[PDB]
From a paper:
However, apo MtFBPaseII was not found to have a stable tetrameric structure, as the subunits appear to be associated less tightly. This observation may suggest that the binding of substrate/product could alter the inter-subunit association of the 222 tetramer. The T84S variant structure has the most visible residues in the structure, ten more than the apo structure. In the apo structure, the C-terminus is displaced by a citrate molecule from the crystallization medium. The apo structure contains a citrate molecule near a proline residue that displaces the C-terminus, which is ordered in the F6P complex, forming a short β-strand. The citrate molecule is bound in one of the tetramer interfaces in a narrow, short ‘corridor’. This passage consists of Pro193 from chain A (Pro193A), His194A from one chain and the rings of two successive tyrosine residues (Tyr279B and Tyr303B) from the symmetry-related chain. Extending forward and backwards from this narrow passage, there is considerable polar space in the proximity of charged residues (Lys274B, Arg277B, Glu301B and Arg305B). Weak inhibition (IC50 of ∼2 mM) of MtFBPaseII by citrate was experimentally confirmed after assaying a panel of di/tricarboxylic acids.
Mtb fructose-1,6-bisphosphatase (MtFBPaseII), the enzyme encoded by the glpX gene, is the third component of the glpFKX operon involved in the growth of Mtb using glycerol as the sole carbon source. MtFBPaseII catalyzes the only unidirectional step in the gluconeogenesis pathway of the pathogen. MtFBPaseII comprises the only FBPase activity in Mtb and is closely related to the class II FBPase from Escherichia coli. The MtFBPaseII monomer is a compact, globular protein with two distinct α/β-type domains (I and II) arranged in an alternating multilayer fashion to form an α/β/α/β/α-fold five-layer sandwich.
Residue numbers in the entry:
A (entry chain A), C (entry chain A): 0 to 311
B (entry chain B), D (entry chain B): -2 to 305
């Protein structure tokens, strides 16, 4: 329901007061607290599948917690109160507050392994992706299915040392790189939205971000492919002991299946799709995206919040 | 406590109205819009009565004054619908056709057929405190202009183009202000007056009483002020109103027109206007542009929807 | 040169003060006077080919007059200080102030006959037009070359009694009609601009408006076809005696030939492409289009004019 | 007296810079931008000298400090070019790369290598009258906020992300304001400060002296104020400036930085920024987004160009 946008609107507005203030935990707490107060007010019966972590040293929106007013069917609840906490704390671009809802039990287990390799593309080339192939074959494939020259392709990649080869290969095909410092989820949405200046998202990031990204892709169209990415053999055992086929190419629908999927986001700082919170004498504005798998409707929502009296 | 889902009602009205723009068929557009809006309001979870609508039930089968509408009996509230504000504009492909819905606590909407027309003045939040419909239009113009920090000749006054407004136009012209004459679209006019960088600084003139009420709902949520006084047609109507309880000397404020504490208003562009883009079609679906506002919070939402 | 936009900017700003004020001549004089003062200041050597009329009871920008600072090659000069004077006087939409420049002698004679039948289309169907055929065959042709359904075609037509059959035919094909009360020139630009919601302009209007429309079409792309339209047999003699082949289908390049063509316009009231003049405490804004045949570059220009002191 | 044709210089810079965004090649983008800008300025009809440019002529072949540029010797004027403000941002595909040109009466531009860095503060027209670079940053914040009618915690202060600004950041944070840290882009930062609904209420910190001069040109035309004081690196430079004629205690105003009566400034988006969209390509050509302003008239033009 469109009401869920008020959850990310509250998370963005709380985080807005911490933009640039060098306090990551201050910003997270504000957003987490505003989001939970407002989510326990929406007509919804939810369990936190993706959130701040497990119960002990994450006392709010911990994985397992119940959320919503009490009524409604039960459903999976994923929340990233600030995707890009460090971006927020330093006043840098592309921080967003993020929520996704899906049928109960239909979200992948975010704790399987911390990281996953991802590639994502918009709808027109949703069926030519292969994460097992080198990035060049994916670039060339997508550039052909989209009929563009390869020097006009843009690949969004997190700027990390572990990506030195991924970055070199993309350049060596002549395509371009949009280097982001954080925001896997925003990066995927960018690759999937019509003519955004970004054709492909590629690289290794977090397993929760990948699941949250898949929920949006289930709504706006396109495809993500993923494989788990153990950080060492210790985690690789833990992943195998738990019963994961570490060679499976996980698809959008593996990460979030289920008939009904909701995604919405609101900008914290100015970014690639959403403007961040802006302040005025009377109040503030927020910029939000809201989407739904069943209809496929996508709404862009600009909201003025008068934090004051009428007619001042 | 938010009810953004009511945007679906004007979104449906406008998507129906939109397959009729530019076809010369005023009633075909109205009819389709009323259809889709009736289907959709009876699927939102709040029971209300249609207080302002398509006339009454002997020759308006749908959205007639008094119809029970909505799905689950939540709280009862007033419903005012204008399936196309700008039906002629819609038929001829012209700008500023919008589809409008208003909802307020049950009983709190003024009576729409007490008198058919009422004289109006309306201005936005920044100059609402100088309004005086009993003063001449020149004094409102100069007062509004001073507050707004504009010369009188920078001012732009929106007036309906009707024979009845010949003296009003003369007196507005005599002051030095510009005029924006509209053929119809009384609601969108008043909303323009209350938006900042819109081009309309003031709305004035005699329009319909339902449109005045719908306008007041909007203003309740976004800020500003409209003042009105009933303007009976002839001698029968002036009797009908005096022996109804109304002081004809009375200035009606926004809150007299819509007095509820919970007012909601939304509108969706049919054709391109100075506030909302019109519905645009392409193969996969269409896009609508809407405004949704709530008086309790004072929150105003611009909603651009891509339907698939 | 982009400097020419200041001519239409001045014409719009002068007319702005007459919007809605019920005085057609007041508005025309203001615009005519502001345009001429500013055109005699641009690096240009011009002769007024299309203007306010002949020398006697049109004392400013009369057909024949010299314009510009004195320097430069000589060139044809067309000016419509307010296209839609009645729209301006009543505060109605779509009034614009209009200027076109072309090689000297390369503009059609605007006095041949008062009126002309016109049809105009954007570039993608610029080669399937035929003004001699019924409107239906032109609609269907354009709808096929554009691959759209015919019920999705929109035809812009002046609302005049002399168009009762043109309007009936367009409806009878199921296409839509954008009924305008004035603004031939704006209507053509609308039909020729990419995705404007207007596919075709059709009908009889003024010969100067048709020539001014062709100058823009020489710049932004597309096609106009025209034939002169005598209002009676008296004018038909005058047109024949002067040596016109009243059956010629005049083309864009017949109306304005010449290697170099300039067009620009600025909104007076709010319209289909340009916003009208808007007033603020410090000043005003104008909205303008400027285009050039040789480059094909089209510029949209928003200008804030501070009619005051700096930093107030 | 208008010279809108100078937009072609940054339009060419940005169209060259744009075929390099997202390629990791900072110098390949710079080089292409300098190329096209040199070609184009030597084809506009006003002779000037490059006063601010790509360094000096032994290892900057083009746009070196002192180069005669322009076509026909009109009046002689000062030329300041920044072919890409945001070269690193351009190489990495990030926002806010712009291509910049500034021109003023000959001799009226401050000397760019008197000192390399200068401390800066800048704000827009509405609060320019409270600026005081000699006061602490907290007092400017609260003063600017009062004028702007904002709480201190609504304020947003743009600061370069450099080790040298650790105390500045601490003192800005200590007041309650938000910060917008930028990695580079000193010019675009200051222009943001002077635009209304931009998100940046104040710019502060030590940046380069050329960028400060280019910024003052902009401000001369659009309104607002920048204040600066020279900030010599070490002991050699502080001598170089004292025995050059400069009072180190001196507050420099906008007009001290650019003193001409005729200043022009234009900029074109390279990548998307908070003021200008970046160059976008398609098959037939491309589109650029530019700002052109002139101090004599105070006219500001947003120019969206479709090149074929």
């Amino acid at each position: 329901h469109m009401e869920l946008v008020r959850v990310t609107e509250a998370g963005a507005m709380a985080a807005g007061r911490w933009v640039g203030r060098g306090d990551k935990e201050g910003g997270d707490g504000a957003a987490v607290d505003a989001m939970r107060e407002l989510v326990n007010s929406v007509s919804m019966r939810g369990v936190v599948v993706i959130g701040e972590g497990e119960k002990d040293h994450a006392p709010m929106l911990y994985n397992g917690e119940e959320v919503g007013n009490g009524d409604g069917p039960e459903c999976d609840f994923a929340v990233d109160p600030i995707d890009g906490t460090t971006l927020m704390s330093k006043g840098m671009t592309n921080a967003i507050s993020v929520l996704a809802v899906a049928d109960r039990g239909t979200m992948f287990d975010p704790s399987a392994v911390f990281y996953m390799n991802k590639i994502a593309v918009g709808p027109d080339a949703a069926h030519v992706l292969d994460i097992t192939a080198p990035i060049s074959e994916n670039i060339r494939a997508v550039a052909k299915v989209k009929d563009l020259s390869v020097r006009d392709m843009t690949v969004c990649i997190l700027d990390r040392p572990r990506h030195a080869q991924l970055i070199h290969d993309v350049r060596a095909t002549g395509a371009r790189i949009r280097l982001i410092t954080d925001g896997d989820v925003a990066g995927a949405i960018s690759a999937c939205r019509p003519h955004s200046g970004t054709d492909l998202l590629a690289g290794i990031g977090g397993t929760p971000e990948g699941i949250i990204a898949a929920a949006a892709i289930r709504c706006m169209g396109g495809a993500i492919q993923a494989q788990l990415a153990p950080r060492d053999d210790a985690e690789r055992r833990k992943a195998l002991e738990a019963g994961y086929d570490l060679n499976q190419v996980l698809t959008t629908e593996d990460l979030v299946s289920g008939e009904n999927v909701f995604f919405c986001a609101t900008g914290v700082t100015d970014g690639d799709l959403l403007k961040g919170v802006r302040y005025y004498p009377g109040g503030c504005t927020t910029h939000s995206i809201v989407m739904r798998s069943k209809s496929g409707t996508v709404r862009m929502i600009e909201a003025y919040h008068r934090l004051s009296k009428l007619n001042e």
